[PDB]
Amino acid sequence: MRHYEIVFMVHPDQSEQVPGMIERYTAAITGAEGKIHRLEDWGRRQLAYPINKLHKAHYVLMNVEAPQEVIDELETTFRFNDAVIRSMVMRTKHAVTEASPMVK
Amino acid sequence: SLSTEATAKIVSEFGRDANDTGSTEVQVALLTAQINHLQGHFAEHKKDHHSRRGLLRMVSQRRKLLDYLKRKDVARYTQLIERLGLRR
Amino acid sequence: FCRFTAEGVQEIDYKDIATLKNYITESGKIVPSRITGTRAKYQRQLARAIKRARYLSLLPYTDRHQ
Amino acid sequence: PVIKVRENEPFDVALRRFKRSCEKAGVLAEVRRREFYEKPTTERKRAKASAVKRHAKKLARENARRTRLY
Amino acid sequence: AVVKCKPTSPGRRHVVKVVNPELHKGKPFAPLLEKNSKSGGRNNNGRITTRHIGGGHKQAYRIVDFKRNKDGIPAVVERLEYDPNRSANIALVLYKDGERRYILAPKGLKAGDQIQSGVDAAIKPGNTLPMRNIPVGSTVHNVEMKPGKGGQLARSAGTYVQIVARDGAYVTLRLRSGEMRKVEADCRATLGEVGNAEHMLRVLGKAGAARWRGVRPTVRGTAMNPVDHPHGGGEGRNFGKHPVTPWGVQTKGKKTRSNKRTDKFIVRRRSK
Amino acid sequence: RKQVSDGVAHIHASFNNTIVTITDRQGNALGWATAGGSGFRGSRKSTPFAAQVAAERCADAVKEYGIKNLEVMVKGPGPGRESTIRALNAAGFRITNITDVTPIPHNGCRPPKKRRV
RNA sequence: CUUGAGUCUCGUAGAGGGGGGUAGAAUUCCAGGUGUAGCGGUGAAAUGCGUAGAGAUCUGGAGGAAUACCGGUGGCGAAGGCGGCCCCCUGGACGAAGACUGACGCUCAGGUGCGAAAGCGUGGGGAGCAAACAGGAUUAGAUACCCUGGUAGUCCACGCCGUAAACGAUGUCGACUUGGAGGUUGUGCCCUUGAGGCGUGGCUUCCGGAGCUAACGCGUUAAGUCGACCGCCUGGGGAGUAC
Ligand SMILES: [Mg+2]
Ligand SMILES: [Mg+2]
Ligand SMILES: [Mg+2]
Ligand SMILES: [Mg+2]
Ligand SMILES: [Mg+2]
Ligand SMILES: [Mg+2]
Ligand SMILES: [Mg+2]
Ligand SMILES: [Mg+2]
Ligand SMILES: [Mg+2]
Ligand SMILES: [Mg+2]
Ligand SMILES: [Mg+2]
Ligand SMILES: [Mg+2]
Ligand SMILES: [Mg+2]
Ligand SMILES: [Mg+2]
Ligand SMILES: [Mg+2]
Ligand SMILES: [Mg+2]
Ligand SMILES: [Mg+2]
Ligand SMILES: [Mg+2]
Ligand SMILES: [Mg+2]
Ligand SMILES: [Mg+2]
Ligand SMILES: [Mg+2]
Ligand SMILES: [Mg+2]
Ligand SMILES: [Mg+2]
Ligand SMILES: [Mg+2]
Ligand SMILES: [Mg+2]
């Protein structure tokens, strides 16, 4: 199992849908025997440059140990869900559980 | 590349001892397994010439080793190539 | 001066926008290693981090109005 | 090279900051270089020449110019 | 695969077959067949209304499902088949409730594959969903023009359409001709490109092949006598005329679209 | 007829020519002037002085609108790039912000070939 | 037998290769707003574009190609070559301690593979650039240089071609022979007291001793002292041409 690190930015008008979404993604990972090493809702945040003409995207961070098939499925879900503006699944070597600088 | 556990299993199978890694038979077996594994990759990626260079090197090493076995000990050579199902 | 020397930084983090802002100029461009004094390995790591942040709109690509 | 003129900043002073900012950014140099396509070989050759000249000049100054000129 | 036939005769030397071994070597599903007698390009007055049509092979008509209305019930692709009535290949599918149906085969599609029409249907090749549901940018085929009418656009081999935009009730389609066209977003559209893409790589190799496909020989207007064609015929090979159809209307470059009812839907006319 | 008080001066300063364009803060152009129209051709319109008189002309043109504050956006490598802003200030606007917006690609389209002179 | 050669364990750095996504800047085009006589170009002009509203400026859209800064006589690769970010597949190099095999090695005529750019075939794509081509200049002429345009091509898939000043103008492998200053990447000890002290490997740049060289220069990455094998040369032209 490969340690990943997903960060996805959500449309701020759909910020209320975010708790359910987090639950769904985590649930899928667990269902597929995926561990969840850190989970940080960073919330609404000011973009450094306007994406799709809209500012203030809602950032969610998720460091996960999962299989790659499930990572692929998650990526596909991200791409087709017209809610997540950006995503960034990024491989990591170890269990990076400590809290991130943005929460710090 | 070949995973650690798989490599260990190969070593145990053909290795006189589980700390034996240099034995000719073990070396040949490891090369063969690697080559077999890489077949799928090269079927997918026919233009991966650099990687195929690596594969070719593996093949050459196996041939050289096999030849060494043939001259040294014929029975071992015959048994090994029957076990592995390698032509000549 | 090479900030990471006191740590011997274990790994540069693209989310650490606080420090990456030391390694980007006013216009958003990456500062040369010769000017900031970063070690070469670390400089490469930082550049990668900056690029990732830019992708995630944590840092800006350029100093323009928005 | 964005500049905003501060309260009670003279215009000439503002201009000076703007010019300095532009020079630091290196906008004019970038544009001039990107005016025409330099071939990759040309770019490599120029880089090599620059490196050689710089090194040679530095060596000459520091080590060769440690003697009595008069 | 494409296969160059060896030159054992001057009839085979230029032939290029497109051979697909995945097709069904067998008889088609008899409930979906029906009679399809030939016209010879003649209308109900018995007159030749389209030249150069005649003869060829007998052909049963497969009843292909362009409407794609079994919403929700998931089907599975049993087998790919040869359809003589179209460039594309068809696919015999089996709906969970027991109904079988022919559909156009999309790209990559094969036996045992699972497909589903509907709104909830997953975005994957061979699935069919209203074009408001399909992501903008997606390549689609068998596209409907009037909601519920049945796919009309991009039915031919390797064809497809780009959903370039969705503004309200209309999606903008970049059609295979290059044409941009507004279509209602309620119009159905099957994901992916239509299969047998190598169809165009085939080379008939002889006159007989065309004949087998029912295409009778074309006679050049300039071969004819002045009474027969506006290109008449002179002593030797003269021409001196501006090119024209047999019925005397300039050919090559003169536009003929006469349709003010539908111009509102044409966002940009094709180019090149 | 309208008044705006605060404009943007877009100084397009190519090697051959200087275009000055005063606009409302939104983007809509009020008046423009060039060294070419200012009465300079060739060697004379590719100079700082020409740019300055172009700037003066532009200021005069937009005098109707009664523009008081002005932010200047300089573009391109040019002989003016300074003369125009100096002239504008002299003509008597408060220069609030000065920004460079020269469009550098991030290694994009291929430039035209090198001149052999 | 274990010193050459290889295997296993753990790490390390890397534009190494193949496939698939994606980001921002910029050019072009398209539609619209503002707006008015110029723009463009050059040594100076003209062709060209613009009162049928261009250039400038703001908004939106399309599409292709390439990845600013970082960036380095930096790195990787047998060479050709490789440069945004992300994932999937994948080859090699290097260090640490051990353990294992036990000369399994070096080189290689034929042979086989890889091999920039241009070029070719078939099917796509086509923004920018640009052989050919067109017009404008310059000129004695100007089938050029300069200017405005501009098609193959440059891009993608899969085949072919099989060559370059494909150069370090320096065949591969191994051993030995004074130094200095760097770069890069490991690793051992020293309290890292700080970025730091003393070692020990790999690759790499410059300078220089002996020696070598016709000289220029090379100089522990040799063009020095040697061993193995290969490739190649024997005056200029004719000619890397004819058959
Ligand atoms: Mg006909
Ligand atoms: Mg014909
Ligand atoms: Mg005919
Ligand atoms: Mg006749
Ligand atoms: Mg007639
Ligand atoms: Mg005739
Ligand atoms: Mg005749
Ligand atoms: Mg005649
Ligand atoms: Mg005639
Ligand atoms: Mg030019
Ligand atoms: Mg790498
Ligand atoms: Mg290496
Ligand atoms: Mg040979
Ligand atoms: Mg090429
Ligand atoms: Mg071609
Ligand atoms: Mg072509
Ligand atoms: Mg051009
Ligand atoms: Mg030209
Ligand atoms: Mg040669
Ligand atoms: Mg070369
Ligand atoms: Mg040579
Ligand atoms: Mg060799
Ligand atoms: Mg030397
Ligand atoms: Mg002779
Ligand atoms: Mg010859």
**Residue F72 · residue F9 · CB < 8 Å:** yes
User: CB of residue C63 closer than 7 A to nucleic acid strand G?
Assistant: no
**Residue F75 · residue F12 · CB < 8 Å:** yes
- Beta-bridge mates of residue E92: E79, E102
Two tokens, residue E187: 């119009």
Residue D68 CB contacts under 8 Å (≥ 6 apart), including other chains: none
**Residue E77 · residue E110 · CB < 8 Å:** yes
Total domains in chain E come to 3
Q: Which residue of A has its CA nearest to E122?
A: A80
Residue in this structure with the two tokens 């024209």, named with its chain if needed: E244
Residue E178 CB contacts under 8 Å (≥ 6 apart), including other chains: E270, E271, E272
**Residue E191 · residue E104 · CB < 8 Å:** no
**E236-271: buried (b, 16+ CB within 10 Å) or exposed (e) per residue?**
eeeeeeeebeeeeeeeeeeeeeeeeeeeeeeeeeee
- φ/ψ (deg, to 5) at E227: -65, -30
Whether residues E125 and E93 share a domain: the answer is: no
Best CA proximity match to C53, nearest among A86, A94, F101, F104: A86
CA-CA-CA-CA dihedral for B78, B80, B85, B86, to nearest 10: -80
- DSSP string of chain E? -EEEPP-SSTTTTT-EEE--TTB--S---GGGEE------SB-TTS-B-STTB-------EE-B-SS---BS--EEEEEEE--TTSSS-EEEEEETTS-EEEEE-BTT--TTEEE-BSSS--SSTT-EEETTTSPTT-EEESB-SSTTS---BS-STT--EEEEEEETTEEEEE-TTS-EEEEETTSEEEES-BS-GGGGG-B--SHHHHHHTTBPPPPPGGGS-TTT-TT---SSS---S--B-TTS-B-SS------SSSGGGEEE----
Two tokens, residue D57: 């000049």
Two tokens, residue A1: 């199992």
From the list F85, F99, F104, the residue facing D2 with the nearest CB is F99
| Whole-angstrom distance, CA of residue F72 vs CA of residue B7 | 69
Q: Show me where the domains of chain F are located.
A: 2-117
Residues in chain A closer than 8 A to C58 (CB atoms): 48
| Whole-angstrom distance, CA of residue A79 vs CA of residue A60 | 15
Q: Do A82 and E123 touch (CB under 8 A)?
A: no
- The nucleotide lying nearest B72 (C-alpha to C1') is G104
Whether residues E241 and E221 share a domain: the answer is: yes
Q: Is A7 helix (H, G, I), strand (E, B) or coil?
A: strand
Best CA proximity match to A15, nearest among A36, A38, A41: A41
Way it was determined: cryo-EM
Q: Do C57 and A101 touch (CB under 8 A)?
A: no
H or E element: which one contains F7? strand F6-13
| Whole-angstrom distance, CA of residue E102 vs CA of residue E93 | 6
Whether residues E190 and E265 share a domain: the answer is: no
**Residue F35 · residue F13 · CB < 8 Å:** no
| Whole-angstrom distance, CA of residue F74 vs CA of residue F80 | 10
**Residue E250 · residue E244 · CB < 8 Å:** yes
CA of E232 from ligand 8 middle (Å) equals 14
Whether residues E125 and E168 share a domain: the answer is: yes
User: CB of residue B38 closer than 7 A to nucleic acid strand G?
Assistant: yes
Last residue of a domain, one of E66, E81, E113: E113
Whether residues E104 and E16 share a domain: the answer is: yes
Which residue range is the domain that position B6 belongs to?
1-88
Q: Which residue of D has its CA nearest to F98?
A: D3
H or E element: which one contains C51? helix C40-55
Q: Which residue of D has its CA nearest to F92?
A: D11
Do at least 3 CB pairs under 8 Å connect C with A? yes
Which residue range is the domain that position E222 belongs to?
195-271
- Gap from D64 CA to G210 C1', in Å? 25
User: CB of residue B76 closer than 7 A to nucleic acid strand G?
Assistant: no
Q: What is the resolution of this structure in A?
A: 3.0
Best CA proximity match to D21, nearest among D3, D8, D7, D6: D3
**Residue C52 · residue A4 · CB < 8 Å:** no
Residue D38 CB contacts under 8 Å (≥ 6 apart), including other chains: D46, F114
Strands (E) located in A18-73: 35-45, 57-66
Give me the F residues in range 31-60 that sit within 7 A (CB) of strand G: 31-32, 34-37, 41-43, 45-46
| Whole-angstrom distance, CA of residue B45 vs CA of residue B33 | 19
Two tokens, residue F52: 């300055």
